[PDB]
Design a protein around this ligand. Structure first.
Ligand SMILES: *[C@@H](O)[C@H](CC(C)C)NC(=O)[C@@H](NS(=O)(=O)c1ccc(F)cc1)C(C)C
Length: 220
């Protein structure tokens, strides 16, 4: 792979969003990955509806504000034949009945790819595909309070992830030979969290916080 990647600079990434007090992280992770792949296919970046996924993707296994998986969201888009735009189907931070309208669909996918569970494969996918949906262990106050720099939490688990986010690139701080490496991660807690809503997460430390444990992207 390249030494560093940032897909924001290539037009693949919408602004940071805010899931509110709803356990819909998986929906924001899924729309981010689909936004990236639809841009790769068409050259147009269009913000996608998390509310459409929250309300409508139960049949694929999601549970609205009580949690879900990005792969189940990619399966819904395939099954349904579409996903509405954010503008047409705005986010309400609470589960409601399904109001999908095909007139306003702006995305589709034909399934998904699960990445092998290690960071060299994750890096290859980020470099060759675009932004990648991942699950991490975010369940520490250090993550809530993160401000800047490379996040490393001694008690992070590589097995027990609870929060879905989006890898948009990677790189290094300091001189290269220090191996001060990070994943560039878009969160869905608003731009006041973190570094404008982003976090750099420890890279190449044996899958810190599980970032390579449940990584995937949609096939468009
Ligand atoms: C993010 O907002 C979600 C918060 C949970 C506590 C509702 N996290 C998830 O949906 C996670 N998916 S899951 O399948 O692991 C899960 C975990 C705990 C739950 F209570 C429900 C579902 C995340 C890994 C996407």
């Amino acid at each position: 792979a390249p030494r560093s990647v940032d897909w924001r600079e290539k037009g693949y990434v919408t602004p940071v969003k805010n899931q509110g007090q709803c356990g819909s992280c998986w929906a924001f992770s899924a729309t981010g990955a689909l936004e990236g792949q639809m841009f790769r296919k068409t050259g147009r970046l269009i913000s996608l509806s998390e509310q459409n996924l929250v309300d409508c993707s139960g049949p694929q296994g999601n549970e609205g504000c009580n949690g879900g998986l990005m792969d189940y969201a990619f399966q819904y888009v395939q099954d349904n034949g579409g996903l509405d735009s954010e503008e047409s189907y705005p986010y309400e931070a609470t589960e409601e009945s399904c109001k999908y309208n095909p007139k306003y669909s702006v995305a589709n996918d034909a399934g998904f790819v699960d990445i092998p569970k290690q960071e060299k494969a994750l890096m290859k996918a980020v470099a060759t595909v675009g932004p990648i949906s991942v699950a991490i262990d975010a369940g520490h106050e250090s993550f809530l309070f993160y401000k800047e720099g490379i996040y490393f939490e001694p008690d992070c688990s590589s097995e027990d992830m609870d929060h879905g986010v989006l890898v948009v690139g990677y790189g290094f701080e300091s001189t290269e030979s220090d191996n001060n490496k990070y994943w560039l991660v878009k969160n869905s807690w608003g731009e006041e969290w973190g570094m404008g809503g982003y976090v750099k997460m420890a890279k190449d430390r044996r899958n810190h916080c599980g970032i390579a444990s449940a990584a995937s992207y949609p096939t468009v």
